[PDB]
Design a protein around this ligand. Structure first.
Ligand SMILES: CCCCCCCCCCCCCCCCCC(=O)O
Ligand SMILES: CCCCCCCCCCCCCC(=O)O
Ligand SMILES: *[C@@H]1O[C@H](CO)[C@@H](O)[C@H](O)[C@H]1NC(C)=O
Ligand SMILES: *[C@@H]1O[C@H](CO)[C@@H](O)[C@H](O)[C@H]1NC(C)=O
Lengths: 249, 293, 45, 292, 192, 249, 249
């Protein structure tokens, strides 16, 4: 009737071991599933390259600092140029997949801090601008902020999630904390959420992956200053339809 | 002609009214501190702004605008319908009602459409006119009657081009028509007065343009060459006024060679030359010649 | 609980539109031929 | 009782054709792609037999593409001005009933050669300034042969047998159900013939295509007035075609109409398709190719 | 019902010639014969089709399309064509090598003079808006390009340029939605 | 499960043999039938002169040229002065009949071209006129164009079928192609279509018979230049009621 | 009890239609199969990207001339840089697949000539050199001749197949003729042949694909000079194991 602190996540040829894990958040209680015949609309037979694309891709490592605001990734965009997933995402017009997001941040028992690892469906990034005409560039975020790639994007205003919504209510989304005294990893299994059965992996980013320090990383002199935060994600039940020439963006 | 750019970001023309008839007055720039564009955030000129209520385009919008008194429902600015701000190649804003189209010819929808990408599309098919509409639609035609549905206010064609949001590309049922000579990589000009532009003028001139414009007024004595626009800030990219029969350089203009107000020539046959490097492309130039018999 | 398609007049043409008899018979326009040609078969053999 | 009929009155969804799952085919003699369009038959090739398809349990409703749903929509069939001001102090107007005066209704009807239908005619009448003062109008249907009124006071407005509707402008739009009124089994939007025998050698030849089976009389509208009212009333007639039976589908009209009762196109023929630069030029930019 | 696609909707081409896809003997290999977008309601070749005109009376369409190409050359004219349907996201393929990565049919001219290329319903949404252009290129259907798989080979004393007639129609799973008013004919005055 | 290229059409004392036939189009899937008692209105006993009128009448031969636009006939009008059908069509006020239209165009295997043989019910012929008053003669077609007789009428604007409707959609009508590489004949069996059970064979033309070259006739020097197009039609189930003096037009 | 001249080959989203086909050679009577559990040695789960890689790739078009010697391709090498097959062939160390080789060469009934389309397992390319020391470069073929890529390689000595073996006995291999009077295509379905269950798609070329003109292309003046030969091949039952970084050569 409890959650075991040890966990092993084996997907494909990738395996993730954690010895200080809180639990595994199954987003909205729904495992990732393949598109049923009732919900499908595209007639082409989808490709399900099970083990070549459904596997853990360690994508980015961000150095947690005392004044760090946080980072966000867009799930399809963060894997669109990586591995056989990226190739299928480029060669195919349609794509659907869940994911198993695994954020890793280990620190000594003398460090402190708390990250909020949340998976935000349809994470539309806002721009912070003064009162200006709709002609103004500052009213709308550039592409580097909407699709940060694999490197992610440092939050400008994590208090409002760079979306005008309060960070305090970001816990309405499938979330997990990395409290350094408690756990060093946060696992979120997110099913494919979209008003469409399939969608373009290049145009549309289904989920945002926010890692925001709520309690700032504090430690004493002599502790290891560099405390990294690693994002390992794994597609789950990846389908691809609409084969054509490979399209980058 | 007061404006020689597509967006009106060259207008210094003393119009403190949204429209010449039936409009709203403009708020002074030295008094509009409630707003981003004023004389405090832009001390020295910086967009024709100053101590005046004149319409300006400092933000690179599609048309010269001005701050109006915010009363109606928060509308604190309005585009100015400056009839003299029409680009010398801009034939006007006209209505598009239906299937007999203003420009009967070829069409093109481009999510990267600019004023020049439409003109270049029509010029490549020997069409005289290029009509942008709805920001993404490009229409070509030789129809001398593109006004078959009546003219329209220039502000009715203020939809941003999908490829360059600083240029007007018509609107819903409104088509902005350009003469396809604008931005050509050369051409023959046998006329009294014409405003020859840089290659791909509403956009930035391409890298590697070697263009030759033939300006021969058969019977003129002197050609008054004026440059209302010379955003040619570079070194290798130069604009030369080569002679005619002799093909000898008469005046070479580049970055630190900005042209005089009138580099008149006594030859009735001038060859406007343009050069472009492989890098550092700028907004271009807009020459204007006036032949005196 | 539906309460519609009710004629209030003695004349039957005063009723609402006949919107419950969707029939699709495209063969009279798509295959108006005497010799029925199988899909897998070469038509003119 | 008959409560079972009232239960099955909502429109049931008829779905589109499902796609079956298909695999690869490597053999001879089975050519579902090769067709013979000369036979006049459309291709019987299915998606399953040309590509490897999946199982798509299609739930898209095809019910809206029915002839009933396509036609049971009130469109403008007539604008009748009851002129009672200026030089035309008539206070009445006798309007030839024709549904081919306006392009939107005319083009939809001419999709079919024969149409047998009942109609729901609605009259949306108002002044020039869009206002609807209480002003009594009389909309009298004058069938072919019934005497047409020649004034606002004439005896024909007694409507002892003619159908007539009295309604003020302030009332909601008068709406009536018109049956299938025609000597023929169906109306005929295209009549390749002449109504009368003879030589048909006139310079104009106005009678070609004129089938009197469609000429259903006149709509006489008057202000119920004793003198000039000084106000012109614009009566817009809207016909909703119900109980539709369509026959012999036709190509939709491509040229702009020029007259009401005749197919007549300009000498400047408009192409059905808009011109493009070349037969190999498509204006779809797509995305950036991965490796050109 | 299959109706003639106006694929030769080019400047100068007038009349029934706009309904022909010219095919001739090529001096080079892997060349492009013709291309056209498969958006039924878009101003283009599909306007000449019954499906492309009935689509315009509706806002959203769904289902597979079908273009039956009929070769109208001499009996002695032989050739193989690659007719490729490129799903959305890609512009018109610049080479046959790029086009053969999509849904394609290699058509062999012969006794059966017609080939059918099904444009499969490859869409993210259940329906595509009939309106195209601008942000409505989200509902782009794709591009059909006709390539010379082999040459157009003829014996001596035989015409070297023939015509392919495209016949566009809708598959059995075709569906329309949200009846609207077409934008095909405009009226400025009541027809008297 | 295929269509045999050889076909013989025996109607009356006429027999038509074809060895390169695509198929036989049965217009709207309905064979020509005699008017049932339920659909009839005229009380006179109709005459059914079976073999004297229901037979193939070879009526016109048109020379297909490279620049030819096409030809159209009106089915009753094309037979109104020919054989015992014409006599019954003149002596009787009422008439109804289907037909078996058989267009013949043979060419060498070195010729090319494609005809569109379509049977258009209620083929109202349009006039092509500039914007003119309703008084103008050009707004309405003369009788030679509405009822071309047995000789037919050369299309003026085959692109719009001389009817304002696009030729490309003429395939909505019962049609057949004569593709010279494939077949040399086009057979269309059309039932009597009219909003009336009977009608005047002189006033009303039930169907138009269009033969339009879509792919123009091209050949090389040395091939037979004269490539004719022959129209053989046969009434099917011809009834005639209302006997009176013979009326020509 | 005969072979039908018409054939349609539907693999993936690709379909190949031929109307003049001799037959389909099933190499050694064995269809391509996936590696059984009994014959497998690698323990990783193979990827079987069925429809994304098993499809017809039209790869090369060679102009048949009167003096042409022939062309040869190496089956894995000819697809190693094409489509999702190439990506799987580069990302995976192990690969096995059959193929459906379809050579296309159409010519008029007034052309003549005969191609020998043979699929040669382990087509080791020989070098033609004078008597020289083993130091000599001419004794061994360069990489352009051993792995010609997608463009193929023009035979130097088709009489000996550039292998020292007589071309006349190349019919011991799965072969088909393209006799221009008889057929315009040659289809060979070859199963995976190797002493190993899987093998490197980059190092090892399992089969050679020779197209040699035995009877030279002769025609008269006026016939179409350019008579192309197109190679469309389709992998069948493609497996890939050993995922790693993508390796080109
Ligand atoms: C009280 C007012 C009642 C209104 C009576 C309306 C009667 C309408 C007649 C039915 C309309 C359909 C037939 C129109 C056919 C005419 C078109 C034509 O062929 O020119
Ligand atoms: C005034 C009472 C009218 C009753 C009309 C019958 C309605 C039946 C209710 C069930 C609706 C039918 C569909 C169903 O069975 O769920
Ligand atoms: C506009 O400026 C001119 C400058 O002379 C001035 O006379 C005029 O009153 C101004 N109009 C408005 C509305 O400010
Ligand atoms: C702005 O400048 C004008 C022109 O000199 C002057 O009349 C006006 O008072 C100035 N307003 C302010 C707020 O400085």
């Amino acid at each position: 009737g409890y959650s075991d602190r040890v966990a092993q996540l084996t997907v494909g040829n990738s395996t993730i071991t954690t010895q200080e894990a809180a639990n595994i958040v199954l987003s909205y209680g729904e495992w990732p599933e393949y598109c049923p015949s009732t919900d499908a609309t595209a007639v082409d037979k989808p490709t399900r390259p099970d083990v070549s694309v459904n596997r853990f891709y360690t994508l980015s490592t961000k150095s947690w600092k005392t004044e760090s605001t946080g980072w966000y990734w867009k799930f399809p965009d963060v894997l669109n140029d990586t591995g056989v997933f990226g190739q299928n995402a480029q060669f195919h017009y349609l794509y659907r997949s869940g994911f198993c997001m695994h954020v890793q941040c280990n620190a000594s028992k003398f460090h402190q801090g708390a990250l909020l690892v949340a998976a935000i469906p349809e994470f539309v990034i806002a721009a912070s601008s003064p009162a200006t005409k709709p002609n103004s560039q500052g009213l709308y975020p550039d592409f580097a902020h909407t699709n940060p790639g694999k490197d992610g994007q440092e939050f400008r205003d994590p208090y409002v999630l760079d979306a005008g919504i309060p960070l305090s209510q970001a816990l309405i989304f499938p979330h997990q904390w990395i409290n350094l005294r408690t756990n060093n990893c946060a696992t979120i299994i997110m099913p494919y959420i979209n008003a469409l059965p399939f969608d373009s992996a290049l145009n549309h980013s289904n989920f945002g992956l926010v890692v925001i320090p709520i309690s700032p990383l504090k430690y004493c002199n002599g502790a290891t200053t560099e405390v990294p935060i690693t994002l390992t994600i794994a597609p789950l039940n990846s389908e691809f339809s609409g084969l054509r020439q490979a399209i980058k963006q | 002609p007061e404006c020689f750019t597509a967006n009106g970001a060259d207008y210094r023309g003393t119009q403190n009214w949204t429209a010449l008839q039936g409009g709203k007055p403009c708020l002074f720039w030295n008094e509009t501190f409630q707003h981003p564009y004023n004389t405090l955030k832009y001390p020295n000129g910086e967009g024709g702004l100053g101590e005046h209520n004149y319409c300006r385009n400092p933000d690179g919008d599609v048309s010269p605008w001005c701050y109006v008194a915010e009363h109606e429902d928060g509308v604190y600015w309005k585009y100015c319908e400056i009839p003299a701000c029409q680009m010398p190649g801009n034939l006007g804003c006209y209505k598009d009602h239906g299937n007999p189209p203003p420009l009967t010819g070829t069409s093109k929808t481009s999510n990267k459409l600019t004023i020049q990408t439409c003109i270049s599309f029509c010029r490549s098919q020997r069409f005289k006119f290029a009509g942008m509409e709805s920001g993404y639609a490009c229409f070509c035609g030789n129809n001398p009657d593109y006004w078959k549905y009546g003219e329209a206010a220039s502000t009715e064609c203020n939809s941003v081009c999908f490829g360059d949001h600083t240029q007007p590309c018509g609107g819903d049922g409104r088509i902005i028509l350009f003469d396809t000579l604008v931005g050509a990589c050369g051409g023959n000009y046998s006329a009294m007065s014409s405003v020859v532009y840089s290659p791909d003028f509403p956009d930035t001139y391409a890298t590697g343009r070697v263009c030759y414009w033939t300006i021969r007024v058969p019977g003129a004595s002197h050609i008054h060459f004026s440059f209302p626009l010379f955003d040619i800030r570079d070194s290798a990219d130069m604009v030369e006024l080569l002679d005619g029969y002799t093909h000898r350089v008469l005046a070479r203009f580049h970055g630190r060679s900005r042209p005089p107000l009138s580099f008149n020539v006594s030859l009735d046959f001038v060859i406007l030359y343009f050069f472009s490097d492989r890098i550092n492309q700028a907004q271009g130039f807009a020459v204007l010649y006036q032949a005196v018999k | 609980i539906n309460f519609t398609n009710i004629n209030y007049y003695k004349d039957s043409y005063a009723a609402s539109a006949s919107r419950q008899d969707f029939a699709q018979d495209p063969a009279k326009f798509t295959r108006p031929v005497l010799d029925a040609i199988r899909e897998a078969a070469a038509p003119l053999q | 009782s008959a409560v079972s009929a009232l239960a099955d009155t909502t429109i049931s969804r008829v779905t589109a054709a499902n796609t079956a799952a298909s695999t690869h085919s490597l053999g001879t003699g089975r050519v579902p792609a090769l067709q013979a369009a000369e036979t006049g038959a459309s291709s019987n090739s299915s998606d399953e037999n040309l590509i490897e398809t999946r199982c798509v349990m299609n739930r898209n409703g095809v019910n809206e593409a029915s002839v009933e749903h396509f036609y049971s929509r009130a469109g403008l069939v007539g604008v009748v001005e009851v002129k009672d001001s200026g030089t035309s102090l008539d206070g009445y107007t006798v309007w030839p009933i024709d549904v081919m005066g306006f392009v939107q209704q005319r083009r939809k009807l001419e999709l079919s050669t024969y149409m047998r239908f009942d109609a729901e005619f609605t009259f949306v009448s108002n002044l020039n300034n869009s206002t609807t003062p209480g002003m009594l109008l009389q909309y009298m249907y004058v069938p072919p042969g019934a005497p047409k009124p020649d004034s606002r006071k004439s005896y024909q407005w007694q409507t002892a047998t003619n159908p007539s509707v009295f309604a003020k402008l302030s009332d909601p739009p008068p709406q009536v159900s018109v049956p299938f009124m025609s000597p023929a089994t169906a109306y005929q939007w295209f009549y390749d013939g002449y109504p009368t025998f003879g030589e048909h050698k006139q310079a104009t030849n106005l009678q070609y295509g004129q089938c009197p089976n469609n000429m259903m009389g006149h709509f006489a509208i008057r202000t119920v007035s004793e003198s000039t009212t000084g106000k012109n009333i614009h009566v817009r007639v809207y016909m909703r075609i119900k109980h539709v039976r369509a026959w012999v589908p036709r190509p939709l009209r491509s040229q702009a109409y020029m007259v009401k009762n005749y197919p007549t196109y300009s000498q400047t023929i408009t192409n059905t398709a808009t011109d493009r630069a070349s037969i190999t030029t498509t204006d779809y930019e797509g995305g950036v190719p991965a490796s050109p | 019902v299959e109706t003639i696609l106006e694929v030769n909707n080019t400047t100068g081409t007038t009349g029934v010639s706009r309904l022909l896809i010219p095919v001739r003997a090529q001096n080079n290999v892997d060349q492009l014969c013709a291309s056209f977008q498969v958006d039924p309601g878009r101003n283009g070749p599909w306007q000449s089709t019954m499906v492309g005109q009935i689509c315009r009376y509706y806002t959203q369409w769904s289902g597979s399309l079908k273009v039956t190409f009929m070769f109208t050359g001499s009996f002695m004219a032989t050739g193989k064509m690659l007719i490729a349907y490129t799903p959305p996201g890609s512009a018109q393929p610049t080479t046959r090598e790029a086009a053969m990565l999509g849904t394609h049919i290699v058509w062999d001219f012969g006794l059966q003079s017609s080939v059918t290329l099904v444009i499969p319903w490859i869409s993210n949404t259940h329906f595509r808006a009939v309106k195209t252009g601008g942000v409505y290129d989200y509902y782009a259907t794709g591009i059909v390009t006709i390539w010379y798989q082999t040459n157009f080979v003829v014996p001596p004393d035989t015409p070297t340029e023939a015509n392919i007639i495209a016949l566009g129609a809708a598959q059995k799973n075709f569906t329309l939605k949200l009846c609207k008013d077409t934008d095909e004919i405009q009226q400025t005055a009541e027809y008297q």
